[PDB]
């Protein structure tokens, strides 16, 4: 009941017009600010108690950001485009020790997004679904978040089938990239925690705050 994909697409268009690891971390810190503005534009997100808004973002920021630069890089050959305007090529990632996870992003996310021509509306919805994760520990009212998630995918499915009537399996194909996103998201965090432990690699304040407990 009330969760128009037009509002979601708008949130998307509204937020987005040497060591490659360092550059990636600087980009992630920069996008963390933009992510907050994005969520605020997602219907009913702001109407939730501040405590739960914090929980949802702290729980999904990584998948949310990974989905964004992945969809943004669909045009690029073998690399991804950072929000800062810099490009990280596959070879560059490999030469810095993060080749395996970088390849997983290109293979499981970017490639697949390109093969099906996932549009901005679809991306927006998928991120909205990730944002509205009812499994987030600590939620004051999980059922309420669960209800919002269902309205997003209800609207998303309607969008599909009407926009891509000739692809009856599109809706399912979209949701089926979520397990991959979750997996890649967890691996990216492990690397990040390790980078912090090792000491090298500058980590800005917003990114660092995301690495705080719990």
């Amino acid at each position: 009941e009330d969760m128009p994909v037009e509002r979601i697409l708008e949130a998307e268009l509204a937020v987005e017009p040497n060591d490659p690891v360092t550059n990636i971390c600087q980009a992630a810190d920069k996008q963390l600010f933009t992510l907050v503005e994005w969520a605020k534009r997602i219907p009913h997100f702001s109407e939730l108690p501040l405590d739960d808004q914090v929980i949802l973002l702290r729980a999904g920021w990584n998948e949310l950001l990974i989905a964004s630069f992945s969809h943004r890089s669909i045009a690029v050959k073998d690399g991804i485009l950072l929000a800062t305007g810099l490009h990280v090529h596959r070879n560059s990632a490999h030469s810095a020790g993060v080749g395996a996870i970088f390849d997983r992003v290109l293979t499981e996310l970017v490639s697949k997004m390109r093969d099906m021509q996932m549009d901005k509306t679809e991306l927006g919805c998928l991120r909205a679904i990730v944002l509205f994760n009812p499994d987030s520990k600590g939620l004051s009212n999980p059922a309420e978040v669960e209800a919002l998630r269902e309205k997003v995918y209800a609207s998303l499915e309607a969008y599909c089938k009407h926009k891509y009537p000739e692809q009856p399996g599109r809706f399912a194909k979209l949701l089926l990239r979520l397990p991959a996103l979750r997996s890649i998201g967890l691996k990216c965090l492990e690397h990040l925690f390790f980078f912090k432990l090792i000491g090298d690699t500058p980590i800005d304040t917003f990114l660092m705050e995301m690495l705080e407990a719990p």
């Binding site: 907050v36 605020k40 501040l50 808004q53 914090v54 304040t205 917003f206 705050e209």
Partner: peptide, 11 residues
């Protein structure tokens, strides 16, 4: 905890 995030959401 989570100082920055809170400040951003409230504004």
């Amino acid at each position: 905890k989570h100082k920055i995030l809170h400040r951003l959401l409230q504004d």
